Design a protein around this nucleic acid. Structure first.
Ligand code: MG
Ligand code: MG
Ligand code: MG
Ligand code: MG
Ligand code: MG
Ligand code: MG
Ligand code: MG
Ligand code: MG
Ligand code: MG
Ligand code: MG
Ligand code: MG
Ligand code: MG
Ligand code: MG
Ligand code: MG
Ligand code: MG
Ligand code: MG
Lengths: 72, 124, 209, 61
RNA sequence: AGCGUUAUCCGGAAUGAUUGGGCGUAAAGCGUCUGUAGGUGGCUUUUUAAGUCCGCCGUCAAAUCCCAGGGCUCAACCCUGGACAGGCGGUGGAAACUACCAAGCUGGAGUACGGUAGGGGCAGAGGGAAUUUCCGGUGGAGCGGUGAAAUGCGUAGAGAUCGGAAAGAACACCAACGGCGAAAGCACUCUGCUGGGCCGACACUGACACUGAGAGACGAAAGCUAGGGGAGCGAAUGGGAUUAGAUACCCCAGUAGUCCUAGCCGUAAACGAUGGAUACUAGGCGCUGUGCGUAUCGACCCGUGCAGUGUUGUAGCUAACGCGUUAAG
């Protein structure tokens, strides 16, 4: 598949969502928790890049994926 | 990070190991820097090639002295200078490579040109 | 010599290589064979004295016969330290050793006991082992030749200390910066030794005039 | 260290260790003596050295 | 015609090291990781001219300092003239560099794929010996322990020896010059869910990078708060010895705790006593993981690339010891 910016966020959005349901049961899996914050951080720096390059794509991507916008 | 900070070292380490070739990276800035060492007599020859779309340059060092080098203006602290405070390394045995509005030149060439600039590295 | 024994120092003077064994370059050395024979031929005309340092068992007698052709000197056995640097002690042992050969001529051995004559016998025998090819030196040489760098590591350093040019064993075992004159390819066999040794000893003969 | 750390004022000078707080910087100072006596000095030396307990006008005993 | 003492400031003091220091062992790297602000940031062609450089204008009073000249019989001192350097503002130009603006690339980073090793983590099932206790059979005097002895167990039948019930905790051999993980740490077996790394390449992205003040998470044992469990070992506390003494070392018994599930505590020589990222800088040996090629193309072996992991060692550094491509260069 492609490697566009919005596509990487879509895969992380599923990779993140897939692990939340896992931690509801295996909450003591702290090694996976260290991996969960990576994908949460990788998308943070990509969306941080998408923001200052084009705000139109930002408002459209966050609207369909139901993403919380950051203050400041 | 700072390319030129790496350029000055790849030439330094080559003299400590006492090698002839360097295989230094090619850019718009380095081609002007190396061009000064040819005319000034610090390097015997330079030569260009490529392996990918990128480019490189191959130098030819000379065979108890040591090829001293030093960087001055860093990214964390840039250093500029006016005409009256142009350095004079070792009374003339050394030179300073500095960037003017009319490109890069030697400090001696700036003494005649009458225009200071950003000192980047000293040589002796 | 091998993949586990090649020194990276000789890399300018290497052409190719093979299955395990190493292949030396004969091109660069040929210039140095000329520079060597030119310097040795020119030096011999002025009347200098030379020295050869050979103690390898394979070329112990070859270096001995090599010195008889010219008026140079050889070192068949080990270096025993301070031969050239501690020359003041060497003159004492040579002045000593020179006298004992005159001591044996006299009939004083008769009036010495059995054991005392044995000590003087074994004393002179020990000096003959190490002070054979030096009996007619009477001074310090001006150029010193090294046949082996590894086994005679000490001899190469006193030359550097006293500031004397020299020839070395620039094959992959050693460091080439120790001698100004460079002649690789001598660790193969006597063929590599005699081909070079006889060639350099030959040049001394015509230089002597 | 890093120049950003220098801008934090990581470096400060050292304060004075003046050896006469009682004088309050003045060269001399008057005082009434309270009790004269002697005292044994440190171990290697040995003597009865003379001293005087003084009440200075600067508010120091 | 002053000389010394004391006090105060600077220097010496590179002893707060922008110029101009250091953190392996001398004082100094958070226990570790993720990340906000902040700092810095790959390459190529343009835009602007904020920074930066040049030329002019105004101004930073006088005195003082600096240079020259003059006047007190000289000097101090007084006077005349003129500064340089540096700061602010305006103005006209130069456009490399920092920065800005408009487009480009793929080497750094990441995604999609296709392969691959491992005690990565969590959860649930399965397995054997060994030890202990009880049940009995057999049998009859010691057993056990120590530098020597005793306490202690035992004819109310010990210990030993076969057979059997049950429980708890921990996994010999494999096992290292070994693997994984950010650390702390992870080893009897499988299975489930799940994280990370490495390599290949012809899908793609187009600098989306590094570090990280605060903050947050994880975090050996010990210990605490409830609820369970407790075989063995074992602080404490007793007893028997050694000793002048023995609130110890030794020996016999032994509580908490050691284990499980919830949570607190957040400390260790939490050490590689060495922060992280990146580029460059001789080699020798051999250990994995994954490719390539030769080869017996059955694997192997041999030869090389990449990412790691250990041991010697050159230059160089280091007060020295020692580090040394995984640097303390
Ligand atoms: Mg740049
Ligand atoms: Mg100071
Ligand atoms: Mg400093
Ligand atoms: Mg210091
Ligand atoms: Mg200590
Ligand atoms: Mg310390
Ligand atoms: Mg971070
Ligand atoms: Mg003024
Ligand atoms: Mg430009
Ligand atoms: Mg912090
Ligand atoms: Mg515990
Ligand atoms: Mg601590
Ligand atoms: Mg530990
Ligand atoms: Mg520490
Ligand atoms: Mg640490
Ligand atoms: Mg080493």
């Amino acid at each position: 598949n492609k490697g566009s910016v919005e596509f990487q966020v879509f895969c992380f959005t599923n990779k993140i969502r897939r692990l939340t349901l896992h931690l509801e049961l295996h909450k003591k899996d702290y090694s996976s928790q260290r991996g969960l914050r990576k994908t949460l951080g990788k998308r943070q720096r990509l969306l941080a890049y998408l923001l200052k390059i084009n705000g139109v794509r930002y408002k459209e991507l966050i609207s369909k994926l139901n993403i919380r916008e950051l203050k400041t | 990070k700072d390319t030129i900070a790496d350029i000055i070292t790849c030439i330094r380490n080559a003299d400590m190991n006492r090698k002839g070739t360097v295989r230094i990276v090619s850019t718009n800035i380095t081609e002007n820097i190396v061009k000064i060492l040819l005319r000034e007599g610090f390097i015997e020859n330079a030569r260009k090639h490529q392996e990918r779309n990128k480019y490189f340059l191959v130098l030819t060092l000379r065979h108890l002295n040591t090829f001293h080098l030093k960087r001055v203006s860093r990214p964390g602290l840039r250093i500029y200078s006016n005409y009256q405070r142009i350095p004079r390394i070792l009374g003339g045995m050394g030179i300073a490579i500095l960037s003017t509005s009319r490109g890069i030149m030697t400090d001696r060439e700036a003494r005649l040109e009458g225009i200071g600039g950003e000192i980047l590295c000293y040589i002796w | 010599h091998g993949t586990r024994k090649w020194n990276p120092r000789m890399s300018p003077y290497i052409s190719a290589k093979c299955k395990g064994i190493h292949i030396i370059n004969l091109t660069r050395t040929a210039r140095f064979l000329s520079e060597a024979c030119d310097l040795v031929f020119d030096a011999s005309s002025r009347g200098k004295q030379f020295l050869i340092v050979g103690t390898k068992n394979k070329a112990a007698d070859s270096v001995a016969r090599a010195a008889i052709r010219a008026r140079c000197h050889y070192v068949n056995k080990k270096w025993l330290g301070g031969m050239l640097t501690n020359w003041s002690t060497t003159e004492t042992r040579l002045h000593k050793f020179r006298d004992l050969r005159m001591e044996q001529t006299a009939g004083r051995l008769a009036r010495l006991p059995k054991r005392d004559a044995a000590v003087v016998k074994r004393q002179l025998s020990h000096l003959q082992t190490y002070l054979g090819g030096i009996k007619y030196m009477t001074g310090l040489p001006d150029i010193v030749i090294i046949v082996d760098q590894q086994e005679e590591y000490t001899a190469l350093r006193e030359c550097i200390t006293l500031g004397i040019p020299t020839i070395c064993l620039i094959d992959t075992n050693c460091n080439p910066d120790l001698a100004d004159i460079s002649i690789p390819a001598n660790d193969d066999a006597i063929a590599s030794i005699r081909l070079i040794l006889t060639k350099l000893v030959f040049a001394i003969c015509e230089g002597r005039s | 260290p890093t120049i950003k750390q220098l801008i934090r004022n990581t470096r400060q000078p050292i304060r004075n260790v003046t050896k006469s707080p009682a004088l309050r910087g003045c060269p001399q100072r008057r005082g009434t003596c309270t009790r004269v006596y002697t005292i044994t000095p440190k171990k290697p030396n040995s003597a009865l050295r003379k001293v005087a307990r003084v009440r200075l006008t600067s508010g120091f005993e």
